[PDB]
């Protein structure tokens, strides 16, 4: 008897789910198009060459949300800068394979904990892998991942934002529609909603450490891809 989605919420769920699926790499063909990376600055090289298409897919995801498009571009810039690494981390974490103990990046590269860490992320690799491991029993479908992405995208607390309250209103829509979908999905996990909100905090911490470490990683800046530098 917990509330299930309203018609307006079902339309929002369709919109955001479709935006996620259209911009999720090899959605169908990721398990098979996946190749395992063999064996510092050299893994830095394969990880730099793939970051830029990952940022771009996040930009595309945001641009297919009509709520995002009614925001002024300077707010869109702040919002995308705040959430790329959180969304990319989530997108990798839901692609954890317990058998290979790998995450898949860009629907094509399987990396191990050690590879991602030695590769340059440091302790944040442990944070993303441990999120993947704990998301296994969550059984998140495309809709739940899309709604998590929409919730991170629509963060009012981002510094420099103009439409702080318009954004919080958008987020509150996604949060309500997301809880209702969860009530409807009836996962066999106790306190599923409170636990998903803690995963949102886990991703927000990943967002801020990537920021922290980028500061420390400056290694001349022309070595880092342009769009990466834009989204720190």
């Amino acid at each position: 008897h917990k509330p299930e989605p309203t018609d307006e919420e079902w339309e929002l769920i369709k919109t955001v789910t479709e935006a996620h699926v259209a911009t999720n790499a090899q959605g169908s063909h990721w398990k098979q198009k996946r190749k395992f990376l063999p064996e510092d600055l050299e893994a830095f090289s394969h990880f730099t060459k793939i970051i830029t298409p990952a940022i771009t897919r996040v930009v595309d995801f945001a641009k297919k949300l009509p709520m995002f498009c009614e925001l002024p571009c300077e707010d869109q810039i702040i919002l995308l800068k705040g959430c790329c690494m959180e969304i990319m981390s989530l997108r990798a974490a839901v692609r954890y394979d317990p058998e290979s103990e790998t995450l898949t990046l860009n629907g094509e590269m399987a990396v191990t904990r050690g590879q991602l860490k030695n590769g340059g992320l440091g302790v944040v690799s442990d944070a993303i892998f441990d999120l993947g491991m704990s998301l296994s029993s969550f059984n998140l479908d495309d809709t739940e991942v899309a709604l998590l992405q929409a919730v991170l995208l629509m963060s009012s607390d981002r510094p420099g934002l103009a439409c702080v309250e318009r954004i919080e209103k958008y987020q509150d829509s996604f949060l309500l529609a997301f809880e209702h979908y969860i009530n409807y999905r009836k996962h066999h996990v106790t306190h599923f909603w409170p636990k998903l909100l803690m995963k949102v905090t886990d991703l927000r911490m990943i967002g801020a450490c990537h920021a922290s470490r980028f500061l420390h990683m400056k290694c001349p800046t022309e070595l880092f891809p342009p769009l990466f530098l834009e989204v720190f």
Partner: peptide
């Protein structure tokens, strides 16, 4: 200064 991000947003 967000010039690439700005381009990608306004396309």
């Amino acid at each position: 200064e967000n010039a690439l991000l700005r381009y990608l947003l306004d396309k």
